[PDB]
Amino acid sequence: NFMLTQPHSVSESPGKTVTISCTGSSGSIASNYVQWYQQRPGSSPTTVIYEDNQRPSGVPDRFSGSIDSSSNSASLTISGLKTEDEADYYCQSYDSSNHVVFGGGTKLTVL
Amino acid sequence: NFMLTQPHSVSESPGKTVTISCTGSSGSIASNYVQWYQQRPGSSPTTVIYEDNQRPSGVPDRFSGSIDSSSNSASLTISGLKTEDEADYYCQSYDSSNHVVFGGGTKLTVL
Numbered sequence A, B: 001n002f003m004l005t006q007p008h009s010v011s012e013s014p015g016k017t018v019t020i021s022c023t024g025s026s027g028s029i030a031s032n033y034v035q036w037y038q039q040r041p042g043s044s045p046t047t048v049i050y051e052d053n054q055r056p057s058g059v060p061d062r063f064s065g066s067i068d069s070s071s072n073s074a075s076l077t078i079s080g081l082k083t084e085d086e087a088d089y090y091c092q093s094y095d096s097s098n099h100v101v102f103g104g105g106t107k108l109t110v111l
Helices: none
Strands: A003-005 A009-012 A018-025 A035-039 A046-049 A063-068 A073-078 A087-094 A100-102 A106-110 B003-005 B009-012 B018-025 B035-039 B046-049 B063-068 B073-078 B087-094 B100-102 B106-110
Touching (some): A003 A087, A018 A087, A018 A106, A046 A063, A073 A087, B003 B087, B003 B100, B018 B087, B046 B063
Parallel strands (some): A009 A106, B009 B106
Antiparallel strands (some): A018 A073, A035 A046, A035 A087, A087 A106, B003 B018, B035 B087, B063 B073, B087 B106
């Protein structure tokens, strides 16, 4: 019954750095790998981070992932924010039964 | 480099049965489990089928999954269609490196 909670929304100005976090409930964040998807309205989700902190090829190094077991959380950090980074972001991992678990989603608004 | 292709859109009248398919490319559909998500606009995706054909508790038995290895495809079938079934649907599986792969998405319009 692992669950991932993220803030509903965050805003930040172009060029600055934003962080979206994802906190485990009813389980340890470190038990399973955390993936981060960017999703544009009506579009399929695209990976920006897998295995906690790996970037697929083609993903800018502006996108970075981290795990903080002390806080039971995972974080997506986007630096040098661009207007095109405005979109929804979802963390995702697995429960003890290795079933997919999604966070609730965060809309990033680039001011 | 496994990829999952689905039709962009389908439409069907209330009470009838619709089928959304998802065809493997550069790989065999049967190599890995297929999951199906329903997603409402701006909302987190919710599982309707996992492990090819399992329904989470709470998902109506109107939702059923199937695999056709002859066609290299997986299918979501929704019967007794209701207006609230109108939403986007995504298949999802894994590539050889066990990385998450999403289909492109299908909008179901309930006429």
